[PDB]
Design an enzyme around this catalytic site. Structure first.
Site, PDB file in Angstrom:
ATOM      1  CB  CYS A 266      20.805  -0.291 -22.216  1.00 39.42           C
ATOM      2  SG  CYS A 266      20.081   1.094 -23.191  1.00 39.42           S
TER       3      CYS A 266
ATOM      4  NE  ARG B 228      24.275  -1.807 -23.814  1.00 43.69           N
ATOM      5  CZ  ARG B 228      24.925  -2.925 -23.529  1.00 43.69           C
ATOM      6  NH1 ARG B 228      26.134  -2.835 -22.997  1.00 43.69           N
ATOM      7  NH2 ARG B 228      24.338  -4.130 -23.675  1.00 43.69           N
TER       8      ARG B 228
ATOM      9  CD1 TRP C  95      14.412   6.258 -29.016  1.00 43.74           C
ATOM     10  CD2 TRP C  95      15.694   8.070 -28.766  1.00 43.74           C
ATOM     11  NE1 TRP C  95      15.543   6.075 -29.786  1.00 43.74           N
ATOM     12  CE2 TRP C  95      16.344   7.179 -29.652  1.00 43.74           C
ATOM     13  CE3 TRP C  95      16.308   9.296 -28.457  1.00 43.74           C
ATOM     14  CZ2 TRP C  95      17.578   7.475 -30.230  1.00 43.74           C
ATOM     15  CZ3 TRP C  95      17.529   9.589 -29.032  1.00 43.74           C
ATOM     16  CH2 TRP C  95      18.153   8.678 -29.910  1.00 43.74           C
TER      17      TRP C  95
ATOM     18  CD  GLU D 195      11.402   0.903 -23.331  1.00 46.01           C
ATOM     19  OE1 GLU D 195      11.551   1.195 -22.130  1.00 46.01           O
ATOM     20  OE2 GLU D 195      12.004   1.530 -24.252  1.00 46.01           O
TER      21      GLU D 195
HETATM   22  C1  HEM Z   1      18.150   6.483 -26.754  1.00 44.37           C
HETATM   23  C2  HEM Z   1      17.224   5.512 -26.558  1.00 44.37           C
HETATM   24  C3  HEM Z   1      17.291   4.402 -25.706  1.00 44.37           C
HETATM   25  C4  HEM Z   1      16.594   3.256 -26.024  1.00 44.37           C
HETATM   26  C5  HEM Z   1      15.748   3.048 -27.306  1.00 44.37           C
HETATM   27  C6  HEM Z   1      16.797   2.370 -24.907  1.00 44.37           C
HETATM   28  C7  HEM Z   1      16.048   1.239 -24.706  1.00 44.37           C
HETATM   29  C8  HEM Z   1      15.961   0.544 -23.520  1.00 44.37           C
HETATM   30  C9  HEM Z   1      15.068  -0.570 -23.277  1.00 44.37           C
HETATM   31  C10 HEM Z   1      14.024  -1.187 -24.264  1.00 44.37           C
HETATM   32  C11 HEM Z   1      15.376  -1.076 -22.038  1.00 44.37           C
HETATM   33  C12 HEM Z   1      14.546  -2.138 -21.302  1.00 44.37           C
HETATM   34  C13 HEM Z   1      13.604  -1.370 -20.371  1.00 44.37           C
HETATM   35  C14 HEM Z   1      12.693  -2.251 -19.534  1.00 44.37           C
HETATM   36  O1  HEM Z   1      12.368  -3.396 -19.945  1.00 44.37           O
HETATM   37  O2  HEM Z   1      12.271  -1.769 -18.456  1.00 44.37           O
HETATM   38  C15 HEM Z   1      16.436  -0.262 -21.530  1.00 44.37           C
HETATM   39  C16 HEM Z   1      17.004  -0.411 -20.308  1.00 44.37           C
HETATM   40  C17 HEM Z   1      18.013   0.392 -19.749  1.00 44.37           C
HETATM   41  N1  HEM Z   1      18.659   1.435 -20.392  1.00 44.37           N
HETATM   42 FE1  HEM Z   1      18.334   2.107 -22.245  1.00 44.37          FE
HETATM   43  N2  HEM Z   1      17.584   2.951 -23.893  1.00 44.37           N
HETATM   44  C18 HEM Z   1      17.887   4.246 -24.383  1.00 44.37           C
HETATM   45  C19 HEM Z   1      18.592   5.211 -23.629  1.00 44.37           C
HETATM   46  C20 HEM Z   1      19.167   5.024 -22.369  1.00 44.37           C
HETATM   47  C21 HEM Z   1      19.989   6.017 -21.740  1.00 44.37           C
HETATM   48  C22 HEM Z   1      20.295   7.455 -22.244  1.00 44.37           C
HETATM   49  C23 HEM Z   1      20.508   5.418 -20.618  1.00 44.37           C
HETATM   50  C24 HEM Z   1      21.349   5.981 -19.615  1.00 44.37           C
HETATM   51  C25 HEM Z   1      22.242   6.996 -19.804  1.00 44.37           C
HETATM   52  C26 HEM Z   1      20.013   4.063 -20.602  1.00 44.37           C
HETATM   53  C27 HEM Z   1      20.223   3.155 -19.539  1.00 44.37           C
HETATM   54  C28 HEM Z   1      19.618   1.899 -19.463  1.00 44.37           C
HETATM   55  C29 HEM Z   1      19.564   1.106 -18.259  1.00 44.37           C
HETATM   56  C30 HEM Z   1      20.410   1.284 -16.980  1.00 44.37           C
HETATM   57  C31 HEM Z   1      18.577   0.159 -18.460  1.00 44.37           C
HETATM   58  C32 HEM Z   1      18.165  -1.002 -17.522  1.00 44.37           C
HETATM   59  C33 HEM Z   1      17.064  -0.424 -16.656  1.00 44.37           C
HETATM   60  C34 HEM Z   1      16.531  -1.394 -15.617  1.00 44.37           C
HETATM   61  O3  HEM Z   1      17.316  -2.301 -15.196  1.00 44.37           O
HETATM   62  O4  HEM Z   1      15.340  -1.230 -15.239  1.00 44.37           O
HETATM   63  N3  HEM Z   1      19.159   3.818 -21.681  1.00 44.37           N
HETATM   64  N4  HEM Z   1      16.800   0.768 -22.410  1.00 44.37           N
HETATM   65  N1  LIG Z   2      13.774   3.601 -23.008  1.00 45.66           N
HETATM   66  C1  LIG Z   2      14.257   3.549 -21.767  1.00 45.66           C
HETATM   67  N2  LIG Z   2      13.879   2.538 -21.022  1.00 45.66           N
HETATM   68  C2  LIG Z   2      14.244   2.225 -19.636  1.00 45.66           C
HETATM   69  C3  LIG Z   2      13.010   1.897 -18.824  1.00 45.66           C
HETATM   70  C4  LIG Z   2      13.407   1.308 -17.470  1.00 45.66           C
HETATM   71  C5  LIG Z   2      12.219   0.994 -16.618  1.00 45.66           C
HETATM   72  N3  LIG Z   2      12.602  -0.215 -15.798  1.00 45.66           N
HETATM   73  C6  LIG Z   2      11.709  -0.902 -15.065  1.00 45.66           C
HETATM   74  O1  LIG Z   2      10.523  -0.568 -15.027  1.00 45.66           O
HETATM   75  C7  LIG Z   2      12.217  -2.134 -14.278  1.00 45.66           C
HETATM   76  N4  LIG Z   2      11.287  -3.257 -14.540  1.00 45.66           N
HETATM   77  C8  LIG Z   2      12.272  -1.877 -12.751  1.00 45.66           C
HETATM   78  C9  LIG Z   2      12.616  -3.109 -11.899  1.00 45.66           C
HETATM   79  C10 LIG Z   2      13.867  -3.758 -12.054  1.00 45.66           C
HETATM   80  C11 LIG Z   2      14.189  -4.891 -11.274  1.00 45.66           C
HETATM   81  C12 LIG Z   2      13.257  -5.385 -10.331  1.00 45.66           C
HETATM   82  C13 LIG Z   2      12.002  -4.745 -10.167  1.00 45.66           C
HETATM   83  C14 LIG Z   2      11.680  -3.609 -10.953  1.00 45.66           C
HETATM   84  C15 LIG Z   2      11.738   2.151 -15.746  1.00 45.66           C
HETATM   85  N5  LIG Z   2      12.379   2.442 -14.630  1.00 45.66           N
HETATM   86  O2  LIG Z   2      10.759   2.795 -16.021  1.00 45.66           O
HETATM   87  N6  LIG Z   2      15.088   4.455 -21.281  1.00 45.66           N
HETATM   88  N7  LIG Z   2      15.552   5.593 -21.832  1.00 45.66           N
HETATM   89  O3  LIG Z   2      16.179   6.413 -21.067  1.00 45.66           O
HETATM   90  O4  LIG Z   2      15.406   5.877 -23.070  1.00 45.66           O
END
Ligand code: HEM
Ligand SMILES: N=C(NCCC[C@@H](NC(=O)[C@H](N)Cc1ccccc1)C(N)=O)NN(O)O
Ligand code: HEM
Ligand SMILES: N=C(NCCC[C@@H](NC(=O)[C@H](N)Cc1ccccc1)C(N)=O)NN(O)O
Ligand SMILES: C[C@H](O)[C@H](O)[C@H]1CNc2nc(N)[nH]c(=O)c2N1
Ligand SMILES: C[C@H](O)[C@H](O)[C@H]1CNc2nc(N)[nH]c(=O)c2N1
Ligand SMILES: OC[C@@H](O)[C@@H](O)[C@H](O)[C@H](O)CO
Ligand SMILES: [Zn+2]
Lengths: 410, 407
Positions: free
Chosen positions: B106, B109, B278, B283
């Site tokens: 993420c 953070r 957000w 993305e």
């Molecule tokens: C406030 C704005 C936030 C921004 C701008 C941000 C941005 C992102 C982005 C760009 C990714 C990559 C997503 C992808 O490629 O699928 C990501 C992944 C992730 N974020 Fe954040 N995030 C935010 C909030 C959160 C919150 C509130 C949580 C949890 C409490 C969080 C948990 C994680 C986790 C676990 C992933 C990895 C997801 C995965 O493995 O598919 N994020 N976030």
């Molecule tokens: N901005 C974000 N972004 C998090 C988006 C995470 C996004 N992740 C994905 O779409 C991962 N590619 C799912 C995946 C992981 C590993 C192997 C296969 C597939 C989802 N859940 O839609 N989050 N928040 O809360 O602000």
């Protein structure tokens, strides 16, 4: 243990068995991954096993494993080592070794080309002037008037550690960098320290923005000597844009031949500390990194201005827009001048085909994702979506300290 | 044992000691790096609980206090007797916030300490879950000024009474494979879309149809619910210069809300814990719109821009990529919906890493995921070395329910 590697865009899954033969460490542990870390005299004791592994690899590649030729060579090398503490590779083994070092370089996206490497044997070299001559011949051969040909020149191997051959330059051709009293930098900031050493050694610098540096060559552990590469041998390309006529007025240009000259080639335990090699550029190396890194020429702003982009907020993506035009300009200029270059879309597509081929014919392909994925438009290239396994195979190209940090001046 | 992390653009070097507290495996070994790989008992429980409680009381400056000792014994006895335990609200909140803090993939953070935690451990049915989710969506959307939040449903017990949200994100567009052989809508959700179709949902068969929620409570079979349209904020995508852009007929939802992950706190597993922050522009603009396996709109956009697509070396895909991303950002800002560009987000993350190194001794980060999908090296994180390791509490991946559920 077979390891699966998946491409998340095509669902194609490959199996890696090659990693089983990996001997060297990676830097990672079962608790931490150092995957994005830039940098994570042999004894007779350690020399023979390394030689044997190599010779076995070699004889198996030529389909003579177990032959009498194979057994005699192992015995001949074993005796030579015990007799002199080292050994000399036959020409065929040197060529095979240099090619495999390239085939095994996990940070190189241009490996589909590995079997086509021209190896120049410079093991008979004894002086810096001798080195200069071999280097000039390499640059002329590789440049080939713009139709670039991959090559590597191999100087004498390391013996006792006190008679090393070294090319002090990072690449055979690079632009000088000069720190000004006002704190600004003229030329390429990446080469400031080397440029100072050259001036200290007697180079009369023209103090411009694109001054080709002199070669600083070290033969047999002696102090390095300066040499100027004949201008007619240094191919350069003026950079202009196909639609922006003011682009040419930025006064940018770059050399056509990329020739890494600071790495160490390890083959069968032997170490070649001077082994300049060259291929051709992928455009983003010049257009993204050399011109746009904040620590390099850093031209994004000037180009952004001339394009009259909204530079009040980053969300206008003025940097991204300008980045693309500069990269269009670089590719355009090289192609117009008929100097070989490859764009990142073409290079990455070829790398995926190379990798699939390697998995089927060799059991794998070590690859460092962090370096393979281009520095711009990452996800629109196929490598972004490709899982890759990184491990170390020999023969290999390794980093070594810059010579000025270890050399004993005479 | 003390690792150093260097930034090659600024030469700044930081030392990492936080990794020494890591406990889970990374997937790598001294011989092979799997850094680019996507998916690398009462006696088991108490040590886990102890590790967590110890970190908790240390964070509140009461390490080794009677309150600490007392709590450790209470949980201890509760596990011995019930084979599990319950977190105090304070611990639940601390855990969820730290799960985010430890999410190495993420880039957002720097916002970790501002997470609104909704305790839904008293939920019992799918209608109850729907109510909690609707409340979460409304709270976090906040008419466009998005606020980070997570809703935590009952923890796992015997694995046969697990709460799960079958959706991948609370809000996503449907995908359908047509006769032509092509795909209509979002290809990434073709399957789930079918499970909704088969489950009973009536698909409008459009290009941007908000999917229905499929909620699972106490192991029972999942039920469908249509999220109130008024609660789903959407942004029509237009370009601040190409009037034809709107004719592409593109839009996206403003609230990204991951709903398929598993939250682990002190050994306790919460299998239904949807969270939302957000979007970072890329993305949507890079991955959702331009992946060849997603909406894959590069050609169409390039065509309307009328650029030479005969040769890859003209970088038409790259030119178009940039415009598409300019359009996403412009639109969200125009409609006053929170969004962040990759330049700002990555700059924030570098600031965050520095804060974490001096205040916590480090920051686990997965470079492969942190570096944006476009313009990699012109963002600061490209030049930043990052160590990846697993710290708990954490968010973990879990199997899609339709591959484990016994109807
Ligand atoms: C406030 C704005 C936030 C921004 C701008 C941000 C941005 C992102 C982005 C760009 C990714 C990559 C997503 C992808 O490629 O699928 C990501 C992944 C992730 N974020 Fe954040 N995030 C935010 C909030 C959160 C919150 C509130 C949580 C949890 C409490 C969080 C948990 C994680 C986790 C676990 C992933 C990895 C997801 C995965 O493995 O598919 N994020 N976030
Ligand atoms: N901005 C974000 N972004 C998090 C988006 C995470 C996004 N992740 C994905 O779409 C991962 N590619 C799912 C995946 C992981 C590993 C192997 C296969 C597939 C989802 N859940 O839609 N989050 N928040 O809360 O602000
Ligand atoms: C045929 C053209 C070739 C292309 C298109 C190509 C492309 C590249 C690129 C783009 C990189 C990354 C460079 C950087 O980011 O600084 C790289 C690295 C590398 N290449 Fe190739 N390469 C080619 C030929 C070769 C040859 C001839 C060899 C050796 C015989 C080789 C050995 C390496 C090595 C060892 C690295 C890592 C360099 C480092 O760590 O600084 N490449 N190559
Ligand atoms: N296209 C290429 N590209 C290779 C260029 C490699 C390029 N590498 C570099 O400039 C790396 N930054 C060196 C480095 C590595 C690790 C830590 C610090 C510094 C160089 N030597 O000029 N080569 N051929 O042969 O065609
Ligand atoms: C810290 C990080 O590893 C570093 O900036 C790497 C990233 N990827 C790279 N990739 C290539 N090809 N070349 C580089 O110099 C780098 N630098
Ligand atoms: C194979 C490789 O790990 C994969 O394509 C990764 C690369 N980096 C990523 N980074 C982010 N933020 N999100 C992703 O889905 C991915 N996919
Ligand atoms: O000015 C000296 C630098 O070019 C040199 O230290 C390089 O960074 C090094 O050789 C890696 O290319
Ligand atoms: Zn690793």
């Amino acid at each position: 243990r077979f390891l699966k590697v998946k491409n998340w865009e095509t669902d194609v899954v490959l199996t890696d068995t090659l990693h089983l033969k990996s001997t060297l460490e990676t830097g990672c542990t079962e608790h931490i991954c150092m995957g994005s870390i830039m940098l994570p005299v042999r004894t007779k004791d350690q020399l023979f096993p390394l030689a044997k592994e190599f010779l076995d690899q070699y004889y198996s590649s030529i389909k003579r494993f177990g032959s009498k030729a194979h057994m005699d060579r192992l015995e001949e090398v074993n005796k030579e080592i015990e007799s002199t503490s080292t050994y000399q590779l036959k020409d065929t083994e040197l060529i095979y070794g240099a090619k495999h070092a390239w085939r095994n370089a996990s940070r190189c996206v241009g490996r589909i080309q590995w079997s086509k490497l021209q190896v120049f044997d410079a093991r008979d070299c004894t002086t810096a002037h001798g080195m200069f001559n071999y280097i000039c011949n390499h640059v002329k051969y590789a440049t080939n008037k713009g139709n670039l040909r991959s090559a590597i020149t191999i100087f004498p191997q390391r013996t006792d550690g006190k008679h090393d051959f070294r090319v002090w330059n990072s690449q055979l051709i690079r632009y000088a960098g000069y720190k000004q009293p006002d704190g600004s930098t003229l030329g390429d900031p990446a080469n400031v320290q080397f440029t100072e050493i050259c001036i200290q050694q007697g180079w009369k610098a023209p103090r411009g923005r694109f001054d080709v540096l002199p070669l600083l060559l070290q033969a047999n552990g002696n102090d390095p000597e300066l040499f100027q590469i004949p201008p007619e041998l240094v191919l350069e390309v003026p950079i202009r844009h196909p639609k922006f006529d003011w682009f040419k007025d930025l006064g940018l240009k770059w050399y056509g031949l990329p020739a890494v000259s600071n790495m160490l080639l390890e083959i069968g335990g032997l170490e070649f500390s001077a082994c300049p090699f060259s291929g051709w550029y992928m455009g983003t190396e010049i257009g993204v990194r050399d011109y746009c890194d904040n620590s390099r020429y850093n031209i994004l702003e000037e180009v952004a201005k001339k394009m009259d982009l909204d530079m009040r907020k980053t969300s206008s993506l003025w940097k991204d827009q300008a980045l693309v035009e500069i990269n269009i300009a670089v590719l355009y200029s090289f192609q117009s001048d008929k100097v070989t270059i490859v764009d990142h879309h073409s290079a990455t597509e070829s790398f995926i085909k190379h990798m699939e081929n390697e998995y089927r014919c060799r059991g794998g392909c070590p690859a460092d994702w962090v370096w393979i994925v281009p520095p711009m438009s990452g996800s629109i290239t196929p490598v972004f979506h490709q899982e890759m396994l990184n491990y170390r195979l020999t023969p290999s190209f390794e980093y070594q300290p810059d010579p000025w940090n270890t050399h004993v001046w005479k």
